[PDB]
Write a protein that binds this DNA or RNA. Sequence first.
DNA 1: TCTTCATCGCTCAGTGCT
DNA 2: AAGCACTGAGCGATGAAG
Lengths: 62, 62
Amino acid sequence: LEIKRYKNRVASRKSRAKFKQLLQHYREVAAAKSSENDRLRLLLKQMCPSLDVDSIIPRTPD
Amino acid sequence: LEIKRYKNRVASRKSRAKFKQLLQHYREVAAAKSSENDRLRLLLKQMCPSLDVDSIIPRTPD
DNA sequence: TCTTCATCGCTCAGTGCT
DNA sequence: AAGCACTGAGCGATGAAG
């Protein structure tokens, strides 16, 4: 019946790792998009300085 | 003692809730910025159709 | 009714901070 | 030094899928 415990242990390890990695994934996505967002906003202001950038599209945290 | 167990049980609950809440937070942030990213990219194409899309800022998936 | 396994709550044994 | 909040992880109970 020790096998039942080892199988049980492995599953737990996988589940916890899956959640931790999912956490990092949304972090990596948010970081990458945030970088673009900053890159895009400036380039938009450069081409069309008269347009209000933060007025039409609010800057979302973080 | 029972006291040691009860405090740690509450702490464990708080800890699991903290991570779950952290995940939702990073999800909500990732979604919002992705939304902003799309909102920005579109407004860019409308104002300057001549500009090359994905060239200056590569469009990451998700 | 009985496996199989993903999730998770309880517990132990630390870890880090002060 | 030593109490405190916090958490990694083994364990067992539960849920969900076959």
